[PDB]
Amino acid sequence: HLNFTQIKTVDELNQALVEAKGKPVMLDLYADWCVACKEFEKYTFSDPQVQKALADTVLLAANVTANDAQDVALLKHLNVLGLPTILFFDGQGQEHPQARVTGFMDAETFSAHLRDRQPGL
């Protein structure tokens, strides 16, 4: 398993971004009712080469299972329309929307995505 730091709100994300100055960041958004999110955890975040590739990346995640007010505010703020979504931030805490992942990617596909599109590295 990869070690994700849980964030709940917009400003916990922002703070995490500020604290991560100089490092690449990755924000995974999941929910318990999300089938493809679990696929990601089981078949992709579990890959030995995927994990190596994220070794130096700050790992954040938001559990939006409850779809409460803070969850919805976070999703809006990030313009996230469905799950799974993964967002990527460079070393200045800026997002690179062109690196978003918005469906399941298998290990080989996600490796290639990180190699070809991951920011801040």
Residue numbers in the entry: 428 to 548
Article passage:
The transmembrane thiol:disulfide oxidoreductase DsbD is a three-domain protein responsible for shuttling electrons from the cytoplasm to the oxidizing periplasm of Gram-negative bacteria. Its central domain (tmDsbD) is located in the inner bacterial membrane and is flanked by two periplasmic globular domains (nDsbD, the N-terminal domain, and cDsbD, the C-terminal domain). cDsbD, like many proteins involved in periplasmic oxidative protein folding, adopts the more conventional Trx fold. Its role is very specific, to acquire reductant from tmDsbD and transfer it to nDsbD.
In this work we have found that replacing Gln-488 with an alanine residue, which cannot form a hydrogen bond or a salt bridge in the active site, has a dramatic effect on the pKa value of Cys-461. Despite the presence of reducing agent (TCEP) in the mother liquor, both proteins were found to be oxidized with a Cys-461–Cys-464 disulfide bond clearly present. The cysteine pair (Cys-461 and Cys-464), Asp-455, and Glu-468 of wild-type cDsbD overlay well with the same residues of Q488A-cDsbD. The only difference is that the side chain of Gln-488 is absent in Q488A-cDsbD and replaced by the much shorter alanine side chain. The carboxyl side chains of Asp-455 and Glu-468 in both wild-type and Q488A-cDsbD are oriented toward Cys-461 and remain in close proximity (<∼8 Å) to the N-terminal cysteine of the -CXXC- motif. The side chain solvent accessibilities of Asp-455 (9%) and Glu-468 (57%) in Q488A-cDsbD are comparable with those in wild-type cDsbD (7% for Asp-455 and 42% for Glu-468). In wild-type cDsbD, the hydrogen bond interaction with Gln-488 stabilizes the carboxylate group of Asp-455 and results in a pKa value of 5.8 or 6.7, depending on the oxidation state of the protein. In Q488A-cDsbD, the absence of this stabilizing interaction leads to a further elevation of the pKa value of Asp-455 to a point where it becomes indistinguishable from the pKa value of Cys-461. The phenomenon of microscopic pKa values occurs between Asp-455 and Cys-461 in Q488A-cDsbDred and, as a result, in a fraction of the protein molecule population Cys-461 has a pKa value of 7.6, which makes it significantly more reactive and prone to reoxidation compared with the wild-type domain. This was apparent when we measured the activity of this variant in the full-length protein in vivo; Q488A-DsbD was only ∼75% functional compared with wild-type-DsbD, consistent with part of the protein population being compromised.
